[PDB]
Design a protein around this nucleic acid. Structure first.
Ligand SMILES: Nc1nc2c(ncn2[C@H]2CC[C@@H](COP(=O)(O)OP(=O)(O)OP(=O)(O)O)O2)c(=O)[nH]1
Ligand SMILES: [Mg+2]
Length: 625
DNA sequence: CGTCCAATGACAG
DNA sequence: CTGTCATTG
């Protein structure tokens, strides 16, 4: 019927509690909540190391100690030294968010997060939940959980549906279930060789993501509003520039309204459709195909970018700047990582604009460091190419990549017209899109589409690039056959993605899976290099400088009862690693970042890392030896 | 019938 | 509760 334990009886009950507790290696933790949402109100933690029994930690109801219990908890939760044990919570970064921000406890020990492992098994799996995992892993214990009906986040986060069950209850059941289940998961991960990949690689990534997510990133409303008004200027100015030819009662937002002037005064339609075709006209025709380009681009640049940023911004009083907080995600098929409260990965790229008298705007420039600080960005120079260069062992690609200069500029130079340089960015970007497309086996006609040429001609260009590099095609067909013989591919770490569709009869599913093996292997392995580089960087930064960890630990300082120095994790652009650092340590931080990124793992070529540095989100790059 | 890859979101019935 | 289109990587 029932087994749970409130731990308070005078002293001795709690005393033998901590006395057993201190001794144990593997153990489980979960917390719970009530109301008032940041929040400092947390009912209490709960701990279970196994069995039907479960232990609760409050914040019937007796009394001796008050702050004492909290000291005991702190002492218990970290790694005195030389003593190495692991700890599990359903999700991680937000529970750690709570422990650090709400109660001011910085948990530091070895970590295991069951949902991340769940993902490590099946990257294609959708967002595991407590019921999902206790269903799939710990069968015999499950029915109890159905008394609640909440599965999304932890049992604290499930406070509403649990509200009738809420209390020590949710935290305890979550604790014990998570423990037995994670013993099952760890068992399955060791049943493969993923465990090394799990505990010694990706959990640290979850951690680094967490202290990032506590850091946030800095923002400037003055710049945001300045460029806002600039975009308004181009908005209305392009409105009148547009309706200078005719205009008839127009507004751009309605495509049926566009159909008037579009289908009337031009008449070239090869509901009807919108995008691809008008890009096709963007190449050749001057009379306002591209007016729709600049307009629609401005529109996406404002309604889907300026607004959520300028909305969910918060301020860090500890700084005196306002900052915005993304969310750690993972759970990609490749193993790459994303962020959503907003997603600032996709933040728009700088582009030129006309009113000589031109102008240019950067939506992203609105991102600023703290007043004393500066922004350090570490870019990998064509990394995925270096990985593929490594596995195919095509010596030619190696030698081409060990030499030329932003080879995309060279491709554009010989392509749309011959210019040595003065290649515009969205041209370089289109060419990049195109080329990276070719490598993964873009279909001949679509390639002919983005380049603007005829099918069979483009196909002859594809056959041409096969002819240029044979190691690529070798490795390609080889890995296809291997994914047939296995039914999965494997990223360098030994994490493997399961492709069901490779063995399928239907030719589209078979084709999509064909390219999919390729991209999952190369990009997946890329994201693994990036992860290792991150956790390495932060791991050195941790002990190498004694100040403290992240801006959240400040709020931890206030709730625990100053200068600004360090460098702090901000963002990842997937081949880029994004830091803000006080302008003291910038050189030290730079060498450390460069070093750890290149020291991630050694391979057939060196991975050159461009390190850009400077004020805000736009920058200059040089370092000398 | 749909043949670059991986992400995130508004939009529509 | 699905597939498009916009951007980035
Ligand atoms: N398949 C594909 N991959 C892309 C595309 N854009 C970016 N990527 C991948 C390849 C490398 C990684 C970073 O791309 P970048 O835009 O940085 O290109 P890069 O190779 O890094 O050069 P640079 O960073 O100097 O622009 O993301 C694209 O349009 N298609
Ligand atoms: Mg790059």
């Amino acid at each position: 019927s029932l087994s749970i334990i409130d731990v308070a009886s005078d002293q001795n009950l709690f005393q033998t509690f901590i006395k057993e507790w201190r001794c144990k290696k593997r153990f489980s933790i979960s917390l719970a909540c009530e109301k008032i949402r940041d929040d400092t109100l947390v009912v209490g933690l709960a701990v279970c190391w196994g069995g039907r029994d479960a232990y609760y930690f409050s914040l019937l109801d007796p009394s001796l100690t008050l702050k004492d219990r909290m000291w005991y908890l702190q002492s218990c939760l970290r790694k005195e030294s030389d003593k190495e044990c692991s700890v599990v919570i359903y999700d991680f970064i937000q529970s750690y968010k709570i422990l650090l921000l709400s109660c001011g406890i910085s948990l530091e020990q070895s970590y295991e997060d069951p949902k991340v492992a769940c993902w490590l098994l099946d990257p294609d799996s959708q967002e595991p939940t407590l019921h999902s995992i206790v269903t799939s892993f710990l069968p015999h214990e499950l029915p109890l959980l159905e008394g609640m009906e909440t599965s999304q986040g932890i049992q604290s986060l499930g406070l509403n549906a649990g509200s009738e069950h809420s209390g020590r209850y949710r935290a305890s059941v979550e604790s014990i279930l998570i423990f037995n289940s994670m013993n099952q998961l760890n068992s399955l991960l060791q049943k493969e060789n993923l465990q090394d990949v799990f505990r010694k690689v990706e959990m640290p990534s979850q951690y680094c993501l967490a202290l990032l997510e506590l850091n946030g990133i800095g923002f400037s409303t003055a710049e945001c509003e300045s460029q806002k008004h600039i975009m308004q200027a181009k908005l209305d100015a392009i409105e009148t520039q547009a309706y200078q030819l005719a205009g008839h009662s127009f507004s751009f937002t309605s495509s049926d309204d566009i159909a008037e002037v579009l289908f009337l005064e031009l008449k070239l339609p090869p509901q009807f459709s919108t995008s691809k075709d008008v890009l096709n006209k963007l190449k050749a025709l001057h009379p306002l195909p591209g007016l729709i380009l600049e307009w629609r681009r401005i529109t996406n640049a404002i309604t889907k970018v300026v607004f959520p940023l300028q909305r969910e911004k918060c301020l860090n009083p500890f700084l005196g700047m306002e900052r915005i907080y993304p969310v750690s995600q993972s759970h990609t098929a490749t193993g790459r990582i994303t962020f959503t409260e907003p997603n600032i990965q996709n933040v728009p790229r700088d582009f030129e604009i006309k009113m000589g008298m031109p102008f240019s705007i950067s939506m992203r420039h609105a991102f600023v460091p703290f007043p004393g600080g500066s922004i350090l960005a570490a870019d990998y120079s064509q990394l995925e190419l270096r990985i593929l260069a490594h596995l195919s062992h095509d010596r030619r690609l190696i030698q081409v990549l060990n030499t030329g200069a932003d080879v995309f500029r060279s491709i554009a130079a010989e392509w749309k017209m011959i210019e040595p340089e003065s290649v515009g960015d969205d041209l370089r970007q289109q060419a990049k899109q195109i080329c990276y497309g070719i490598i993964y086996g873009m279909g001949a006609k679509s390639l002919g589409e983005q380049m603007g040429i005829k099918e069979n001609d483009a196909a002859c260009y594809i056959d041409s690039f096969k002819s240029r590099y044979t190691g690529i095609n070798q490795f390609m067909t080889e890995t296809v056959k291997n994914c047939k013989r296995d039914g999965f591919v494997q990223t360098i770490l030994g994490r493997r993605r399961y492709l069901p569709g490779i063995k399928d009869n239907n030719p589209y599913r078979k084709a999509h899976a064909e390219r999919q093996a390729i991209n999952t292997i190369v990009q997946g392995s890329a994201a693994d290099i990036v992860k290792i580089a991150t956790v390495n960087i932060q791991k050195q930064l941790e002990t190498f400088h004694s100040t403290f960890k992240s801006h959240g630990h400040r709020e931890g300082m206030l709730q625990s009862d100053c200068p600004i120095r360090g460098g702090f994790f901000i963002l990842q652009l997937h081949d880029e690693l994004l830091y803000e650092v006080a302008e003291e340590d910038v050189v030290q931080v730079a060498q450390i970042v460069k070093n750890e990124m290149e020291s991630a793992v050694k391979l057939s070529v060196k991975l050159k890392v461009k390190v850009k540095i400077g004020a805000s989100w736009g920058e200059l790059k040089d370092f000398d030896v």
